[PDB]
Write a protein that binds this ligand. Structure first.
Ligand SMILES: C[Se@@+](CC[C@H](N)C(=O)O)C[C@H]1O[C@@H](n2cnc3c(N)ncnc32)[C@H](O)[C@@H]1O
Ligand code: SF4
Length: 340
């Protein structure tokens, strides 16, 4: 049930680092097919005759490379920066925004040069101290879902835990958190889970852990002293969404009752999609119920890239107000960090 790749690519340079060496040893011992690639951003020969086949097979492919981009991207409103530990995901969420993100790849990538990466993170922290600098580790991947293979996130958690002015956060749809429970987080990591209505999870989130699985994991990480949070996203106006999301927060409260929820956080993100979304999603998920009708949406223009469709202002406000009402009803004193 925890993710294991069926095909693994290595950059030759990756073997020079401890994680690369360790993964090569692990995967050869398991007898898994291993290939070489010059760059992790140009992987050749992933099997499949159709686009759909190559896409599905890429989602079962792990690529082990070196992070050569010095700059960390900003990650507002979640955090100051995205810390780059991995890219890609084994999940098959129909709506996933990563599908149409510039330069995104369908395969799962992990970076081995953690010394370089954490040193750069410390540099950003130093540049802003004594202000707090937050790092998002799950901006372009499900870092938690991959981590049982690498422990890169566990190392990041403990790196940030040792800093004075650094904070870490990440969000997951996976329950495989056991190895992270004894990590020395030192109160400086916010462990979040993506949750949604029964409609959205059942119809649009195949290849992820169940709602009960995500909540079991949430109880574990809270019990281990992590700061707990939830990301309600994508907020999607399906038939009967009002009651659907009411029952989400009601069930969420029942599954967390007894626990201290004085520092619990919520983040709210409405469903958004880009212009190329329809063609990409229809090819990859032919039977999807996902509504990508742009005529009923408002378009936000891009800045340096292309923009995105979101719900019209009045629909978005309706969503925000309704979610805020439910959170106030079932989780008094929980902080809503933002709606976007
Ligand atoms: C990019 Se997701 C990476 C982290 C992890 N693998 C996870 O799924 O939680 C980050 C969040 O953004 C949501 N999200 C994904 N696509 C969309 C979208 N199109 N519109 C609106 N929201 C979208 C997902 O449900 C997540 O809550
Ligand atoms: S899990 Fe997070 S990342 Fe993996 S697919 Fe579903 S959304 Fe995209």
């Amino acid at each position: 049930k925890p993710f294991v790749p069926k095909l693994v690519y290595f950059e030759p340079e990756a073997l020079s680092y401890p994680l690369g060496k360790e993964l090569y040893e692990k995967f050869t011992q398991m007898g898994i097919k291993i290939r070489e690639t010059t760059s992790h951003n140009q992987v050749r020969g992933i099997p499949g005759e159709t686009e759909l086949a190559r896409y599905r097979n890429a989602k079962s492919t792990l690529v082990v490379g070196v992070r050569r981009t010095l700059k960390f991207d900003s990650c507002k409103p979640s955090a100051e920066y995205a810390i780059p530990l991995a890219t890609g995901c084994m999940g098959h969420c129909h709506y996933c925004y990563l599908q149409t993100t510039l330069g995104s790849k369908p395969y799962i990538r992990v970076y081995v040069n953690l010394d370089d990466i954490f040193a750069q993170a410390q540099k950003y922290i130093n540049e802003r101290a004594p202000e707090i600098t937050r790092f998002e580790a799950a901006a372009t991947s499900d870092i938690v879902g991959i981590d049982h293979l690498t422990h890169s996130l566990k190392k990041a958690i403990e790196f940030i835990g040792a800093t004075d002015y650094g904070r870490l956060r990440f969000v997951t749809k996976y329950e495989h958190v056991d190895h992270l429970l004894d990590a020395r987080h030192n109160g400086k990591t916010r462990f979040r889970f993506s949750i949604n209505s029964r409609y959205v999870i059942n119809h649009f989130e195949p290849g992820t852990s169940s709602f009960d699985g995500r909540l079991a994991a949430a109880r574990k990480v809270a019990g281990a002293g992590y700061k707990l949070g939830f990301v309600v996203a994508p907020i999607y106006r399906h038939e009967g969404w009002e009651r659907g999301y009411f029952e989400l927060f009601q069930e969420l409260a029942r599954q967390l009752e007894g626990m201290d929820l004085s520092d619990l956080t919520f983040e709210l993100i409405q469903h958004r999609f880009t212009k190329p979304a329809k063609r990409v999603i229809e090819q990859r998920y032919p039977k999807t119920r996902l509504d990508l009708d742009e005529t009923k949406r408002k378009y936000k223009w891009g800045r340096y890239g292309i923009g995105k469709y979101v719900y019209r202002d009045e629909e978005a406000k309706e969503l925000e107000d309704t979610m805020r009402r439910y959170i106030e009803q079932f989780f008094p004193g929980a902080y809503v960090q933002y709606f976007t």
